[PDB]
Structure formats: structure tokens, C-alpha cells
Design a protein around this ligand. Structure first.
Ligand SMILES: CC(C)N1CCN(C(=O)c2cccs2)CC1
Ligand SMILES: CC(C)N1CCN(C(=O)c2cccs2)CC1
Length: 168
């Protein structure tokens, strides 16, 4: 059973205009089997549009590629991002709801630290009473953590089924 193709794709921005399907593939095949690899080009001039995409055989291979950033492809540092879940909302912060009053910082840290490096955990409290409001924000050092988090169907933290969204 293969993972949905959308979850196996990486949009690669910032390409050198000299990058080709072949050189993009030769680069990204270091981290997994590529089922597709395309440089976007103008339909008339064939000049590169400066971005492209690669599709790996598995999600674990996407993770491997993202963990190997920064990627310097044909002399230029590129910007890989997972496919949208059609514009990417590139953020480093999530809202975590449904955590009730008994969820503490270590619950959120022990879970979310496996998605990425955490910089801030903010457990929301009531401005008047100080009581926990049942939601939190987690800020990571990089957007890929958030991208991995929000495409999961479920998040279980401190026994609670949590609702997690990108936060601006
Ligand atoms: C066959 C399947 C159950 N394998 C279990 C391990 N595995 C992962 O842990 C993944 C990590 C990131 C996304 S997939 C997918 C491969
Ligand atoms: C066709 C082209 C102009 N689109 C603009 C760039 N784009 C994104 O913002 C991304 C999607 C997923 C990760 S990046 C999608 C492609």
C-alpha cells in the first residue's frame, strides 16, 4: 500500500536556471527512489521557471531529503517544501487545541520534539483567572516540522485527541 502521491512530493524552489530534469534527479536520488522529477519550463522558450518538483517512492524518503537540507543544487541553495494540503502557507508555529487543563509543557515537548526542534511552547491561560484555557502554541525552528504535523489525521497528547493547525 503506497502513501498518497501528494504526500511524497517536494516542490523545489530557487533553482538555478541551468538545473535540468537530469541534474535535479541526480541530486535528489541521494535520499531515495524518485518516481518523478521535473523542472518547470516556459512552454515557448524552454527557459527554466526556476522551480520544479520531485516525487519519492515513500514518505520516509521525503523526510530524509528534508533532513539533508540545506541542498545546494548545481551551485545554488534551493528551497524544498512539501506539497500543499495551491499556495504554501510557510509557517513555524502551530495551534494545539483540545488539551484541557491537565496538559503541561513536558507533554507537548515530549510529543512535538520528534517533529522538529522546538523554540517556544506557550500554554494559554486566562487573562483574568490564570486558569488554563485548553490550548497552546508551539514554535519550531523550521517550517517542515509544521508541514509534517498538520498532514497527520490524528494527534494524541496526554491522552487527548488534539486539533492542530498552522498558526500565523
Ligand atoms: C510500512 C510502514 C508501516 N513503515 C513503517 C515506518 N514508516 C514510518 O515511520 C514513516 C516515517 C515517516 C513517514 S512514514 C513507514 C514505513
Ligand atoms: C505553479 C506555481 C506557480 N506554484 C507556485 C508555488 N507553489 C507553492 O507555493 C508550493 C506548493 C507546495 C509547496 S511550495 C505551487 C506551485
Amino acid at each position: 500500500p503506497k502513501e498518497p502521491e501528494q504526500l511524497r512530493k517536494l516542490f523545489i524552489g530557487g533553482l538555478s536556471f541551468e538545473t535540468t530534469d537530469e541534474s535535479l534527479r541526480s541530486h535528489f536520488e541521494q535520499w531515495g527512489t524518485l518516481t518523478d522529477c521535473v523542472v518547470m519550463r516556459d512552454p515557448n522558450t524552454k527557459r527554466s521557471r526556476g522551480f520544479g518538483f520531485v516525487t519519492y517512492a515513500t514518505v520516509e524518503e521525503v523526510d530524509a531529503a528534508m533532513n539533508a537540507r540545506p541542498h545546494k543544487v548545481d551551485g545554488r541553495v534551493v528551497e524544498p517544501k512539501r506539497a500543499v494540503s495551491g499556495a504554501h502557507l510557510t509557517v513555524k508555529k502551530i495551534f494545539v487545541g483540545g488539551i484541557k487543563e491537565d496538559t503541561e509543557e513536558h507533554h507537548l515537548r515530549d510529543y512535538f520534539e520528534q517533529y522538529g526542534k522546538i523554540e517556544v511552547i506557550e500554554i494559554m491561560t486566562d487573562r483574568g483567572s490564570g486558569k488554563k484555557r485548553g490550548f497552546a502554541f508551539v514554535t519550531f525552528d523550521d517550517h517542515d516540522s509544521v508541514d509534517k504535523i498538520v498532514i497527520q489525521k490524528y494527534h494524541t497528547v496526554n491522552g487527548h485527541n488534539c486539533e492542530v493547525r498552522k498558526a500565523l
